[PDB]
Amino acid sequence: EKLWVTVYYGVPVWKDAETTLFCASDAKEKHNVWATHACVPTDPNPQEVVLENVTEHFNMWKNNMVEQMQTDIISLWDQSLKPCVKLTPLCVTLNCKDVNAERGEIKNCSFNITTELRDKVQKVYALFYKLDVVPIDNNNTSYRLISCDTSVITQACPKISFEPIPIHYCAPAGFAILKCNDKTFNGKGPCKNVSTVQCTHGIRPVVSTQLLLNGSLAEEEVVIRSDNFTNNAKTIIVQLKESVEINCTRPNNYTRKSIRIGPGRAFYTMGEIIGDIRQAHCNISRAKWNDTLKQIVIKLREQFENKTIVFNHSSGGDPEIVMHSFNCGGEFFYCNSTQLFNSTWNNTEGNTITLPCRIKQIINMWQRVGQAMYAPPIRGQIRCSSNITGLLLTRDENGTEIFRPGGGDMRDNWRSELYKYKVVKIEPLGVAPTRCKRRGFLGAAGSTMGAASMTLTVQARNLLSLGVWGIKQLQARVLAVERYLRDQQLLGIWGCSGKLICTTAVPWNASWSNKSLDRIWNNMTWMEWEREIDNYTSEIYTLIEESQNQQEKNEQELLCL
Amino acid sequence: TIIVQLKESVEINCTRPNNYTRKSIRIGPGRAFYTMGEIIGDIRQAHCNI
Amino acid sequence: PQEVVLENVTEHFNMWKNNMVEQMQTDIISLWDQSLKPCVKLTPLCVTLNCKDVNATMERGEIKNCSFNITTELRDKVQKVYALFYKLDVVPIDNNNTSYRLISCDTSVITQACPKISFEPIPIHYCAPAGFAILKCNDKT
Amino acid sequence: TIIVQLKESVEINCTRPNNYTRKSIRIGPGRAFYTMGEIIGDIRQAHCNI
Amino acid sequence: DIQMTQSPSSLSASVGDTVTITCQARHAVGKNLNWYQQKPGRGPQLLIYMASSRHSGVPSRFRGSGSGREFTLTINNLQPEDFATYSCQQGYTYPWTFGQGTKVEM
Amino acid sequence: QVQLQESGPGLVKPSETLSLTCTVSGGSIDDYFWNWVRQPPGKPLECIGYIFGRGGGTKYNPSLDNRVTISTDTPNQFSLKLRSVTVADTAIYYCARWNLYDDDFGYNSFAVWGRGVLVTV
Ligand SMILES: *[C@@H]1O[C@H](CO)[C@@H](O[C@@H]2O[C@H](CO)[C@@H](O)[C@H](O)[C@H]2NC(C)=O)[C@H](O)[C@H]1NC(C)=O
Ligand SMILES: *[C@@H]1O[C@H](CO)[C@@H](O[C@@H]2O[C@H](CO)[C@@H](O)[C@H](O)[C@H]2NC(C)=O)[C@H](O)[C@H]1NC(C)=O
Ligand SMILES: *[C@@H]1O[C@H](CO)[C@@H](O[C@@H]2O[C@H](CO)[C@@H](O)[C@H](O)[C@H]2NC(C)=O)[C@H](O)[C@H]1NC(C)=O
Ligand SMILES: *[C@@H]1O[C@H](CO)[C@@H](O)[C@H](O)[C@H]1NC(C)=O
Ligand SMILES: *[C@@H]1O[C@H](CO)[C@@H](O)[C@H](O)[C@H]1NC(C)=O
Ligand SMILES: *[C@@H]1O[C@H](CO)[C@@H](O)[C@H](O)[C@H]1NC(C)=O
Ligand SMILES: *[C@@H]1O[C@H](CO)[C@@H](O)[C@H](O)[C@H]1NC(C)=O
Ligand SMILES: *[C@@H]1O[C@H](CO)[C@@H](O)[C@H](O)[C@H]1NC(C)=O
Ligand SMILES: *[C@@H]1O[C@H](CO)[C@@H](O)[C@H](O)[C@H]1NC(C)=O
Ligand SMILES: *[C@@H]1O[C@H](CO)[C@@H](O)[C@H](O)[C@H]1NC(C)=O
Ligand SMILES: *[C@@H]1O[C@H](CO)[C@@H](O)[C@H](O)[C@H]1NC(C)=O
Ligand SMILES: *[C@@H]1O[C@H](CO)[C@@H](O)[C@H](O)[C@H]1NC(C)=O
Ligand SMILES: *[C@@H]1O[C@H](CO)[C@@H](O)[C@H](O)[C@H]1NC(C)=O
Ligand SMILES: *[C@@H]1O[C@H](CO)[C@@H](O)[C@H](O)[C@H]1NC(C)=O
Ligand SMILES: *[C@@H]1O[C@H](CO)[C@@H](O)[C@H](O)[C@H]1NC(C)=O
Ligand SMILES: *[C@@H]1O[C@H](CO)[C@@H](O)[C@H](O)[C@H]1NC(C)=O
Ligand SMILES: *[C@@H]1O[C@H](CO)[C@@H](O)[C@H](O)[C@H]1NC(C)=O
Ligand SMILES: *[C@@H]1O[C@H](CO)[C@@H](O)[C@H](O)[C@H]1NC(C)=O
Ligand SMILES: *[C@@H]1O[C@H](CO)[C@@H](O)[C@H](O)[C@H]1NC(C)=O
Ligand SMILES: *[C@@H]1O[C@H](CO)[C@@H](O)[C@H](O)[C@H]1NC(C)=O
């Protein structure tokens, strides 16, 4: 009957929020493009409290972590190429002839380099791939670099490695990462088995298109994830149970000559052909791909009803868009992934699929324009050993569904992995009625009001407290300190100098909640209660501040006389 | 320095009469020098009337 | 806005020791440099400028038909281009011949203002951090 | 290294007895390149007296 | 080439309502999208460039945003002068394909 | 205030050469791609080709089997030549200005369009 407001600090409550997370690298230097120095060392053992009774709603397609990863990887890519040589004096008209052998793919190009010595003009010979070389005239021998006229071409430093390294994202103080531990999760929906993690699992930022290379696999069955499943033109991420294997080789052996540009800067180019001119023939085991296509078309028939499903190749066009593109060995491959999607299923030649591939050195990454990167050639054969881990399918009318290898920007290459994780902002302050007057972190979040009110200590303890990454981290830490001082000042103005639980003695009106203490301190989670009194939060807070502290302060001011 | 603040403002109208066209000359890969083109009309002078 | 007339207080103001003026100077310089930083540098343009005059309150001698040799997108090839410049932006060289240069490019990295950046003044309010305050003098004279 | 710190300060006074002229040069497209000009006086050695 | 589609093919609206037009790319184009306005008897006018920047002199009411293959143009406070055929164009690969076009009716 | 005006015949029979001329008023030709585009009835706008500056590099829509040639005739006029014109080529042809520079409005967009000329077959 005689109920009073009591303020509880450290409540296991949260709401959806978007922030910047700290990148952490495995403890395990190589100057790898995604800099190790930027990212903190990983904790030796992660903690994964298995939140019980918590059924949170996840949605891969509205997830700020994916966009944050896109921005972070773009920033790290640009910063890694910042101090490397810029190929400004190489737009010169190139006299090119076909290499005497593929046919016409490699061009023997002569050009006059005018070095910074400025008393010589050196005629030099170099080999360029056909994809990077475009005509400039009706003369069949005069060409230029493909994108050097509308962009500044940055040469990648040969000392930068492109080998994938697992990168974790760890929550800052004041936020939490909730992981969905289900096995057949469909990306968008409620999750029945939720845990809280400080950092995510190892994520290899593999860059590829039409197909996801390396990474985690499904545990129960092949999982097909799409936001709507009927609008079309929405990537149908496919995660597999068993991994096919993309063995890929570039047979040709090449020698890398260097040409001075300025004092301490060099353009690394292709010297001459050693051995015969072969082609890059990626080998995929046909039987295994058969099985994978079966285990995918079954699920697609389940989702799209028993229609005939046809896997077609992508629509024709320029090689960069249409063809699959590895990041293996430091050489950018573009493979004609047509034999893999050439089947009608409804309801015999060879045993290995050989995909031809073309190597390209001048590239435009992240779908940007006006910027371009030159990858210097690698001496010797390149022998990949990748693992088929996922597919990206897109849809296009006689009762047949046409699926094609499609995809999108690199965000869709990480929705396939960060589909079991969500970032949540925690608001530790809450209020509840009591009779008085003046496990791990969120482990009791799904528990009732009673017996969750005994664990605020851990949540209160663990909730709070150079360069571009530096400034972002400084802004994040300052914001966290701000939040913490917001909470502490709210507690101070409420007369709770240092009391996780502080009784107010403000009367508990019956227009907020009419439920009795038994039905308020049991039968409900802190989430349902915080939602319930959401509208009255401002009013209640006002009453805790105005009605008491002021009056209590005046009273104590009047007690010493 | 002596700073004088007035009770009421004095309107000043300035005109650049000469009619101009902008020509862009490429400096480099995506860099433009935006500069003078042809002059249309007669060549008068820019004047301020107080 | 939150303005509170302080009664019974008389405060000594001195604008010539007002640190806000220097702070605004730093602010304006930094804004100018920030706005001009992602724009075109005209260093490749500073060349021997062989410039004639333009024949037309008429002007006389102010606008000059000024030509120079620039590199095209192929680097090796050169192209002859022309533009009109005012007398003030050009400096004579080699005594009394027609060769000119651009003023101050002998010692400064001439930056071009991006045309999409507007120089229109917009009112700026200065606000102090919490724990500080700004006292306004309301005496008419 | 055997670092030595002194109780008293020894005095070193050094001058270059030459008069020069800063001859700005303009070799390429860009900011001008400064360098030495002509010796107005004679050619004498710069010395450090102890 | 990269096929572009948009939705709806046509819609009706009155003065003062908000209109949303979705442009979908068959392949990712980054932020390199432009929005054009076409009226009879007049050439196309540029409304938005680089998918979120309004062109000079375009009314503030026109708002456009998106990334990857997905973009949306939102016209708030529809004016009688804004009834026109709106189209989206890419900018990444040449030829820069346009789109079917949505006609805004009274 | 740059304006573009197309001119040429409004009727060309099949298989001869279609010739159009775009004249630039207001300003002289400058270092922006000058592009020919068309809109057939009931179809989206299709890029035909472009030329850079006053004589220079060109590029043409690959899916035309090299039937198109573009060149500059006068410092304020450029022209489109389209060979082997067929009945499918009936369209409203526009000439447009495509910007290369990110320091001005309309980066990578047809900032300036002409009125457009209807050519049938
Ligand atoms: C819910 O998810 C948790 C966390 O992933 C699962 O607990 C793991 O269970 C496996 C079973 O082999 C153990 O090896 C791990 O050590 C457990 N992890 C932790 C952090 O305790 C749990 O099994 C899942 N429960 C379900 C699906 O009912
Ligand atoms: C690229 O072209 C250059 C010149 O066209 C070739 O260089 C010549 O190679 C032959 C090989 O027998 C030598 O005898 C000549 O002395 C070379 N000439 C010069 C000027 O260096 C080069 O071999 C060509 N590379 C390829 C792979 O065909
Ligand atoms: C500035 O000088 C240039 C030459 O350097 C002039 O360009 C000529 O202009 C006339 C105008 O009738 C054209 O017929 C010529 O073909 C142009 N010649 C060139 C570019 O070599 C230009 O007219 C002059 N401008 C002014 C305002 O006097
Ligand atoms: C410059 O290249 C041209 C290409 O035709 C060639 O004729 C000429 O010899 C080269 N000049 C020098 C100095 O190497
Ligand atoms: C899926 O897209 C269709 C397109 O007509 C739309 O009607 C439907 O509401 C969408 N469904 C969801 C769940 O977004
Ligand atoms: C490259 O050299 C290795 C050396 O073992 C050889 O096996 C290989 O065949 C060479 N490549 C070609 C294309 O001949
Ligand atoms: C790929 O298959 C071809 C089939 O002829 C074979 O010659 C080649 O060695 C294979 N490559 C690898 C890396 O297994
Ligand atoms: C791929 O390479 C591995 C290397 O161990 C080899 O075992 C495997 O047979 C190769 N796969 C194919 C399909 O040739
Ligand atoms: C789709 O596949 C069918 C055969 O299943 C083929 O006839 C058709 O041309 C393909 N369409 C494309 C590549 O657009
Ligand atoms: C892939 O190879 C097939 C073989 O028929 C060919 O038709 C197709 O054009 C190739 N794709 C590309 C993008 O070059
Ligand atoms: C697709 O399959 C058909 C039927 O087996 C075959 O004729 C065709 O060549 C295949 N496509 C490719 C690109 O090999
Ligand atoms: C499986 O691959 C074989 C050749 O190894 C081929 O004949 C067969 O058609 C494939 N399976 C299906 C279901 O298409
Ligand atoms: C690739 O698959 C093989 C299958 O045996 C597995 O041993 C290997 O660890 C996988 N590699 C990666 C990087 O996951
Ligand atoms: C406990 O909460 C549930 C969920 O709203 C409700 O149906 C039930 O009646 C509540 N218990 C009491 C005693 O009100
Ligand atoms: C609280 O505000 C929300 C806002 O959506 C409203 O739906 C709800 O009815 C309000 N509840 C109250 C006043 O109890
Ligand atoms: C400015 O004054 C001059 C004086 O000759 C006059 O001709 C001109 O019209 C005036 N301009 C304006 C804009 O009032
Ligand atoms: C430089 O321009 C002048 C203009 O008088 C011309 O005589 C000369 O040939 C040009 N030089 C070059 C290298 O183009
Ligand atoms: C050095 O030369 C300059 C030349 O202007 C002259 O003014 C100056 O007096 C000279 N100084 C000495 C110390 O001789
Ligand atoms: C250094 O000593 C020499 C000894 O001949 C003398 O001529 C000269 O003036 C001295 N220099 C200074 C700077 O005292
Ligand atoms: C300036 O030139 C333009 C060219 O179209 C013209 O419209 C305008 O009227 C001219 N200015 C004056 C004052 O006539």
Short mmCIF file of N, CA and C in Angstrom, two decimals, chain A residues 36-98:
data_model
loop_
_atom_site.label_atom_id
_atom_site.label_comp_id
_atom_site.label_asym_id
_atom_site.label_seq_id
_atom_site.Cartn_x
_atom_site.Cartn_y
_atom_site.Cartn_z
N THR A 36 47.83 -3.50 -38.41
CA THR A 36 47.74 -4.12 -37.09
C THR A 36 47.87 -3.08 -35.99
N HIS A 37 48.70 -2.05 -36.21
CA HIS A 37 48.98 -1.07 -35.17
C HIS A 37 47.72 -0.34 -34.73
N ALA A 38 46.80 -0.08 -35.67
CA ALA A 38 45.58 0.65 -35.34
C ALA A 38 44.74 -0.10 -34.32
N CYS A 39 44.73 -1.43 -34.40
CA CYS A 39 43.85 -2.27 -33.61
C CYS A 39 44.56 -2.81 -32.37
N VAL A 40 43.86 -2.79 -31.24
CA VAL A 40 44.41 -3.18 -29.95
C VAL A 40 44.62 -4.69 -29.92
N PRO A 41 45.45 -5.23 -29.03
CA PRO A 41 45.57 -6.69 -28.94
C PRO A 41 44.33 -7.30 -28.32
N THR A 42 43.96 -8.49 -28.81
CA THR A 42 42.77 -9.17 -28.33
C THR A 42 42.96 -9.69 -26.91
N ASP A 43 41.85 -9.76 -26.18
CA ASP A 43 41.88 -10.38 -24.86
C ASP A 43 42.22 -11.86 -25.01
N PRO A 44 43.03 -12.44 -24.10
CA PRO A 44 43.40 -13.86 -24.30
C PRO A 44 42.22 -14.81 -24.31
N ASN A 45 41.24 -14.62 -23.41
CA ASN A 45 40.04 -15.44 -23.36
C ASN A 45 38.81 -14.55 -23.47
N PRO A 46 37.91 -14.73 -24.45
CA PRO A 46 36.66 -13.97 -24.44
C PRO A 46 35.68 -14.54 -23.42
N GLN A 47 34.75 -13.69 -23.00
CA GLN A 47 33.68 -14.07 -22.09
C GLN A 47 32.36 -14.04 -22.86
N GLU A 48 31.61 -15.14 -22.78
CA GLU A 48 30.32 -15.29 -23.47
C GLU A 48 29.30 -15.77 -22.44
N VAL A 49 28.76 -14.84 -21.66
CA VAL A 49 27.66 -15.17 -20.77
C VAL A 49 26.44 -15.56 -21.60
N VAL A 50 25.85 -16.70 -21.27
CA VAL A 50 24.75 -17.27 -22.08
C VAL A 50 23.45 -16.74 -21.48
N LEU A 51 23.11 -15.50 -21.85
CA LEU A 51 21.85 -14.87 -21.46
C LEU A 51 20.68 -15.83 -21.63
N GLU A 52 19.99 -16.10 -20.53
CA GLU A 52 18.87 -17.03 -20.52
C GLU A 52 17.59 -16.23 -20.33
N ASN A 53 16.52 -16.67 -20.99
CA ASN A 53 15.19 -16.06 -21.00
C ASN A 53 15.12 -14.79 -21.84
N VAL A 54 16.21 -14.38 -22.48
CA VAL A 54 16.25 -13.18 -23.31
C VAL A 54 16.03 -13.62 -24.75
N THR A 55 14.99 -13.10 -25.38
CA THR A 55 14.67 -13.37 -26.79
C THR A 55 14.67 -12.04 -27.53
N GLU A 56 15.83 -11.65 -28.04
CA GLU A 56 16.00 -10.39 -28.74
C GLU A 56 15.70 -10.56 -30.23
N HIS A 57 15.32 -9.46 -30.86
CA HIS A 57 15.02 -9.42 -32.28
C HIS A 57 16.24 -8.88 -33.02
N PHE A 58 16.80 -9.69 -33.91
CA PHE A 58 17.95 -9.33 -34.72
C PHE A 58 17.51 -9.03 -36.15
N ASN A 59 18.31 -8.21 -36.84
CA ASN A 59 18.05 -7.89 -38.24
C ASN A 59 19.38 -7.58 -38.90
N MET A 60 19.85 -8.49 -39.76
CA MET A 60 21.12 -8.25 -40.46
C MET A 60 21.03 -7.06 -41.40
N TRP A 61 19.86 -6.78 -41.96
CA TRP A 61 19.75 -5.78 -43.02
C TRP A 61 19.63 -4.36 -42.50
N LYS A 62 19.50 -4.16 -41.19
CA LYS A 62 19.62 -2.84 -40.56
C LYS A 62 20.60 -3.02 -39.40
N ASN A 63 21.89 -2.94 -39.72
CA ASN A 63 22.95 -3.24 -38.77
C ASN A 63 24.08 -2.26 -39.03
N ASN A 64 24.26 -1.30 -38.11
CA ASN A 64 25.26 -0.26 -38.31
C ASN A 64 26.68 -0.81 -38.28
N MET A 65 26.90 -2.00 -37.72
CA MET A 65 28.24 -2.57 -37.69
C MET A 65 28.76 -2.83 -39.10
N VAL A 66 27.89 -3.24 -40.01
CA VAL A 66 28.34 -3.54 -41.37
C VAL A 66 28.82 -2.26 -42.06
N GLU A 67 28.05 -1.18 -41.93
CA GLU A 67 28.46 0.09 -42.53
C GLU A 67 29.71 0.63 -41.85
N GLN A 68 29.82 0.43 -40.54
CA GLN A 68 31.03 0.85 -39.83
C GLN A 68 32.24 0.08 -40.33
N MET A 69 32.07 -1.22 -40.61
CA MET A 69 33.17 -1.99 -41.17
C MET A 69 33.54 -1.51 -42.57
N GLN A 70 32.54 -1.18 -43.39
CA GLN A 70 32.83 -0.65 -44.72
C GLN A 70 33.65 0.64 -44.62
N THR A 71 33.21 1.56 -43.76
CA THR A 71 33.94 2.81 -43.60
C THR A 71 35.34 2.57 -43.06
N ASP A 72 35.47 1.68 -42.07
CA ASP A 72 36.77 1.43 -41.46
C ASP A 72 37.73 0.79 -42.45
N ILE A 73 37.26 -0.18 -43.23
CA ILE A 73 38.15 -0.84 -44.18
C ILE A 73 38.55 0.11 -45.30
N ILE A 74 37.62 0.97 -45.74
CA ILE A 74 37.99 1.96 -46.75
C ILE A 74 39.05 2.91 -46.19
N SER A 75 38.87 3.36 -44.95
CA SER A 75 39.83 4.27 -44.35
C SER A 75 41.20 3.61 -44.20
N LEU A 76 41.23 2.35 -43.74
CA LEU A 76 42.50 1.66 -43.57
C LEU A 76 43.17 1.40 -44.91
N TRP A 77 42.38 1.07 -45.94
CA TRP A 77 42.94 0.88 -47.27
C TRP A 77 43.57 2.16 -47.78
N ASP A 78 42.87 3.29 -47.63
CA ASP A 78 43.42 4.55 -48.10
C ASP A 78 44.66 4.95 -47.31
N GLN A 79 44.64 4.74 -45.99
CA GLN A 79 45.79 5.12 -45.18
C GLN A 79 47.00 4.25 -45.49
N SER A 80 46.78 2.97 -45.76
CA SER A 80 47.90 2.09 -46.08
C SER A 80 48.57 2.47 -47.39
N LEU A 81 47.81 2.97 -48.36
CA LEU A 81 48.36 3.41 -49.63
C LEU A 81 48.78 4.88 -49.62
N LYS A 82 48.61 5.58 -48.51
CA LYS A 82 48.94 7.00 -48.46
C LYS A 82 50.41 7.28 -48.74
N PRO A 83 51.38 6.64 -48.08
CA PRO A 83 52.79 6.99 -48.31
C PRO A 83 53.45 6.28 -49.48
N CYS A 84 52.70 5.52 -50.29
CA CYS A 84 53.30 4.80 -51.40
C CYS A 84 53.45 5.71 -52.61
N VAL A 85 54.21 5.23 -53.60
CA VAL A 85 54.52 6.03 -54.78
C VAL A 85 53.25 6.28 -55.58
N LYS A 86 53.09 7.51 -56.05
CA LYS A 86 51.98 7.89 -56.93
C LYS A 86 52.50 7.97 -58.36
N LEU A 87 51.93 7.15 -59.24
CA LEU A 87 52.37 7.06 -60.63
C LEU A 87 51.84 8.23 -61.46
N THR A 88 52.32 9.44 -61.13
CA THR A 88 51.93 10.59 -61.94
C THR A 88 52.60 10.61 -63.31
N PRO A 89 53.97 10.39 -63.47
CA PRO A 89 54.59 10.52 -64.80
C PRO A 89 54.59 9.20 -65.57
N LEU A 90 53.43 8.56 -65.68
CA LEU A 90 53.29 7.34 -66.46
C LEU A 90 52.03 7.34 -67.32
N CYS A 91 51.43 8.51 -67.54
CA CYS A 91 50.32 8.64 -68.47
C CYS A 91 50.82 8.82 -69.90
N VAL A 92 52.15 8.73 -70.10
CA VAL A 92 52.77 8.99 -71.39
C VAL A 92 52.16 8.08 -72.45
N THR A 93 52.12 8.58 -73.69
CA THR A 93 51.64 7.78 -74.81
C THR A 93 52.51 6.53 -74.92
N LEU A 94 51.87 5.37 -74.99
CA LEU A 94 52.58 4.10 -75.02
C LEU A 94 52.50 3.50 -76.42
N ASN A 95 53.66 3.18 -76.99
CA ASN A 95 53.73 2.46 -78.26
C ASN A 95 53.69 0.97 -77.92
N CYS A 96 52.58 0.30 -78.22
CA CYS A 96 52.38 -1.08 -77.80
C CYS A 96 52.24 -2.01 -78.99
N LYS A 97 52.85 -3.19 -78.86
CA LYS A 97 52.72 -4.26 -79.83
C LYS A 97 52.31 -5.54 -79.11
N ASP A 98 51.57 -6.39 -79.82
CA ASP A 98 51.13 -7.64 -79.23
C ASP A 98 52.33 -8.52 -78.92
#
